[PDB]
Amino acid sequence: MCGTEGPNFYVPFSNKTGVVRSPFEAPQYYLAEPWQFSMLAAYMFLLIMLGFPINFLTLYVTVQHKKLRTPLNYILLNLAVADLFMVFGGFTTTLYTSLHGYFVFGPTGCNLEGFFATLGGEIALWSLVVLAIERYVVVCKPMSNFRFGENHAIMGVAFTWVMALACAAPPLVGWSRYIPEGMQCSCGIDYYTPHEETNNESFVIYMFVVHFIIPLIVIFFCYGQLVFTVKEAAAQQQESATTQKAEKEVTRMVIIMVIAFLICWLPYAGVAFYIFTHQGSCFGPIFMTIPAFFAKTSAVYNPVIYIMMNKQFRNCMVTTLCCGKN
Ligand SMILES: *C/C=C(C)/C=C\C=C(C)\C=C\C1=C(C)CCCC1(C)C
Ligand SMILES: *[C@@H]1O[C@H](CO)[C@@H](O)[C@H](O)[C@H]1NC(C)=O
């Protein structure tokens, strides 16, 4: 063999030895070293012990603090919730699994895991588009001034959850399916079987075009455009350089949250994709394990970039923790 096609799983390990068990019945210790399986669980623990407060803290600095009612404060408060859903939904279940070297919870567990991660990535990807749009509408202003009401922010934040669920939910109902990846301690969209009863190949190419391409294409159109008013339509469009200061600061962060995304997220699809097309070309259980567990930091770093490149915020953040003020 290459790997071992099951009813609800696929493995990158030869059943020519017979040795292949199922990731819903007993240990996959036969995949790497039972020292290595601990490494997942160890990694997962820090990310659980990291995301919880650094995402809890921001989801509260804001709910508490007043002045913090700007369109960015919302989206970074939208990741603030999205991330804790990864952690208490995905991560707890994903970790607990790696100690066992296989899912104990049945596929009924590999749903949360896969789901609540797909989910978090998609709220991230979309929270960027609405962030990108915002920057376009704000920096190189189009026409007049229905300039964002706290309203338009809602319509945006609610926007992400919608779009982001139009990707994660379907595989859950059986437009696709959450299935164990790599070392079988992470679950992600069935790129493996051609399995027919879920029209697999459709959903997978669905999920790319509209939850990858398009999302990016919008992002990218706005990307460059974020260098037009940082110059001449600023030297000409007379905006007090007190605003070409705080606003040219928001643009850096956003720009960096993008890079951040593509640094973190791109390697996963590097494989996810390769798999889909070179389906059944032999490969190991570390091929898709690294990108998965790595890209899984998506539930940690955005609130931090935020403490690191947003001064007003950071100062409320210390006000909170230090009681009264700094
Ligand atoms: C650790 C396990 C995870 C993150 C499980 C599943 C992830 C996906 C199905 C990824 C979806 C995608 C995202 C979130 C962003 C880039 C496009 C994508 C389809 C690879
Ligand atoms: C092949 O793998 C299957 C399914 O995991 C398993 O049930 C079977 O015992 C293995 N092969 C043999 C020859 O028994």
Residue numbers in the entry: 1 to 326
From the paper:
Owing to their importance in many signal transduction pathways, G protein-coupled receptors (GPCRs) are target molecules for important therapeutic compounds. Rhodopsin, one of the visual pigments in the retina, was the first GPCR to have its crystal structure determined. The structures of ground-state bovine rhodopsin and of one of its recombinant mutants (N2C/D282C) have been solved in space group P31 with two molecules in the asymmetric unit. While investigating the nature of this non-isomorphism, it became apparent that the crystal structures could also be described in space group P64 with one molecule in the asymmetric unit.
The index transformation applied was h(new) = k(old), k(new) = h(old), l(new) = −l(old). A description of the refinements with REFMAC5 was submitted to Acta Crystallographica and the two referees pointed out that the data set for the mutant rhodopsin was twinned. Refinement in the higher symmetry space group and inclusion of twinning led to a substantial improvement in the refinement of the mutant structure. Averaging of the additional replicated reflections by recognizing the crystallographic twofold operation parallel to the z axis must have improved the accuracy of the diffraction measurements. The two crystal structures still differ in the packing interactions between helices 5 in neighboring molecules that are now related by crystallographic symmetry operations rather than by noncrystallographic operations in space group P31.
